Design a protein around this ligand. Structure first.
Ligand SMILES: [Mg+2]
Ligand SMILES: [Zn+2]
Length: 333
């Protein structure tokens, strides 16, 4: 992987983000992308500002330049897909920053854990091609065959981890180069455990383990910390429904288009197409958002908030407000 140039760095550094508070729960990444004709530079400047603003990189021997090289090495490995692109991982980074610092989840974790979570956000979907794990297994693609042969069905999550390790293997983009011994091991292991926990096939088991640890005053402390990190990266990853309605809706449209493009490819390869992925099904956004709220997001956010993360109550409130707004879309159709 090629060194990041001075010119690439300088193109991010000129972005001043006038009128944006990247720390705010109502921060609007779509408005930031519309603000200039260099949205990839603005997105990188958001991630850079969130990471320096935390004060964390400085504390772990990570220079401004190495941090920016890391961000641009991550950026080069996202594809032009509708949803799982650089804007998604910057959104997850910004969202996690709000959970940590507006939701006071930083109180549950060490500074190192907080740093790892923010850095993990940016690696967690590296080289996503807008196809889910099921597509690779159903089509017996080479990556699918390798996952089956090697005994790990988390096809994409293992791939993202491989590319994160590649980026961090060069000192010029290793945000963990300031660490050694146990701290460096913890940074890599916790980053990798977090990315592997984003596989939605593990959703219920991950949530259940976190809830049982939070309820147990004798839980192993290292295990509680790791599960809190995993749960925060999962929370960031399914946070679209916790955002103001019009942000929530723009994410939902990007997701649907990505799913439709998968369904198109599955049709042309003659494998099973789920109704969600079928253009011709014409399923209404309102009903899909209400369904995802009722069966996945509202129970997830309500359970973690009640178990332990009381400061993230605003997520449960916004989901309830977004569900009521989708209900008004159905009521007036
Ligand atoms: Mg993912
Ligand atoms: Zn993701």
């Amino acid at each position: 992987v090629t060194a990041i140039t001075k010119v690439e760095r300088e193109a991010v550094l000129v972005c001043e983000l006038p009128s944006f508070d990247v720390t705010d729960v109502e921060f609007d990444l779509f408005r930031a992308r519309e603000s200039t004709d260099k949205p990839l530079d603005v997105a990188a400047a958001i991630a850079y500002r969130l990471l320096l603003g935390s004060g964390l990189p400085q504390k772990f021997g990570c220079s401004d330049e190495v941090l920016l090289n890391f961000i641009l090495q991550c950026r080069k490995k996202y594809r032009n897909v509708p949803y799982h692109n650089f804007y998604h991982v910057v959104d997850v980074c910004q969202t996690i920053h709000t959970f940590l610092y507006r939701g006071n989840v930083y109180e549950k974790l060490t500074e190192l854990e907080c740093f790892v979570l923010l850095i993990t956000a940016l690696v967690h979907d590296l080289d996503h091609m807008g196809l889910n794990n099921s597509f690779y297994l159903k089509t017996e693609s080479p990556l699918g065959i390798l996952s089956s042969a090697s005994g790990n069905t988390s096809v994409l999550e293992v791939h993202h981890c491989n590319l994160a390790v590649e980026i961090l293997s060069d000192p010029e983009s290793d945000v963990f180069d300031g660490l050694e011994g146990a701290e460096r091991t913890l940074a890599f292991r916790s980053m990798i455990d977090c990315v592997l926990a984003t596989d939605m096939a593990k959703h219920g088991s991950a949530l259940e383990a976190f809830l049982a640890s939070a309820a147990d005053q004798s839980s192993d402390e290292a295990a509680f910390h790791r599960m809190t990190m995993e749960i925060i990266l999962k929370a960031g990853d399914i946070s679209n429904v916790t955002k103001p309605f019009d942000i929530s809706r723009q994410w939902a449209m990007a997701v649907t288009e990505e799913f439709y493009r998968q369904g198109d490819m599955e049709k042309e390869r003659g494998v099973e197409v789920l109704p969600m992925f079928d253009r011709s099904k014409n399923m209404e956004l309102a009903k899909g958002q209400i369904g995802f709220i009722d069966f996945v997001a509202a129970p997830f956010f309500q359970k973690i908030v009640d178990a332990c993360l009381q400061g993230m109550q605003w997520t449960v409130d916004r989901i309830k407000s977004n569900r009521a707004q989708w209900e008004r879309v159905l009521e007036t159709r």
